Amino acid sequence: PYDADANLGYQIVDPTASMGENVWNMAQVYNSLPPELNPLRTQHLADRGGGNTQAAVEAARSAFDAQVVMEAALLQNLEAAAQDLPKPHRLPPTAGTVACNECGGAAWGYSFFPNTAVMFGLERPFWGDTLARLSKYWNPTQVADPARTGQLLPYGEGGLRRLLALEAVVGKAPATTGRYRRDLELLLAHPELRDGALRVPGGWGPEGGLQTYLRGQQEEQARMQRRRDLA
Amino acid sequence: QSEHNVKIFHNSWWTHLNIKNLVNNQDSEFINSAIIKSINNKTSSEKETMQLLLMSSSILLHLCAIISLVSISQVRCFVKFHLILLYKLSNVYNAILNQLSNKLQKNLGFLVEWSSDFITIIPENVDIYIWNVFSKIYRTIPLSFISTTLG
Amino acid sequence: LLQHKCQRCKGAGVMTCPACLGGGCRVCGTACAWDAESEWMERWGEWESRLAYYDKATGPLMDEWY
């Protein structure tokens, strides 16, 4: 692999020099990328046929660098949250949350006024206080009684229709993992696949993992058995 | 139970970077209000007293911090070094650009200072200039204060 | 000392959409790139392939084999 350049070069880095030297060696000739994205591998052929050989590899290099930068940013946020600091990167909302309306979604800022609570060390709220708050927020009270007020139903809508199997033993069926049912069945039909000599790559679909090995085995046994039929 | 080692190498590799301009796609106003709102709301001419107290406290805090900082000897060494560097670089720039400027009009060491005390190399007209500018800037504070507070 | 935080979100900057805590909600954000659970081992395969190149854990044995 040192000649197919599939792995990093012979002695590009060893951990006993200077990170100063180790970078220079890293940025000599596109050693900061694997081959599949390196443009030196593709700079020689780009033709009328597809026009993707030099474009659809630059469009992959770009996503690569974007993911690397995202990792750097998320780690800076994790470092700012390991202490109690405010996180520096304000990312957009996601599939369960909306942006704060009071602020813009910017969650903090500098103000020229000294933030007395940090200076005097009064930032965090003393566990018992939060306990009391949450305990009085999860336990609302009904001071009116249905005796006088003609409401015998609990709050909500469609109460009249609101009041119209083996969940008490095994219980619920988990619906997030049907996509593996098939595979498990196969793992029961062929016990020999459970030996330590086999090491399947992995995955769920028919194009991944155990089904690949099964298809290979069955097609090859049929192929060469029909090869036996020629003689 | 094993024992762990100190790591001296490419340590964490992610503080080497200022990536804020990339992540926030460029290519603090609700704050200074909640503050003033609170001190107006919670505590016959009392709110003006509280606000003046806040502004004076904040300005004094920043000034006390700066003076306490530069009251350390090594920090004075630091600022002296930066001053001689900026003086020499300004001298280079001045020579070059003034020479090219009167050319366009035609168209149409370090140790002697770094090892000597500060005041013997700097003239007095410089500090007199600084003082005159300061005085001229702030000489209208009493009248502005008086007019502001009194209707 | 000078850092202040929005008091309504407590510095989070982002509040909850209760419509989802219990074709869907259209107020609350765009699903992330990893919400697709049926694309997990594929992305992991690509990433571990790319990571196999940079790796130098078996550097000495590969070196003396070369």
Binding site: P114, T116, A117, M119, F120, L122, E123, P125, F126, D129 | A34, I35, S38, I39, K42, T43, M50, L53, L54, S57, L61 | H4, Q7
Partner: peptide, 15 residues
């Protein structure tokens, strides 16, 4: 600032 702290401290919900 210690005079103003009980007043400013309501921006966090504390005493």
């Amino acid at each position: 600032l210690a005079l103003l702290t009980p007043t400013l401290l309501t921006l966090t919900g504390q005493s």
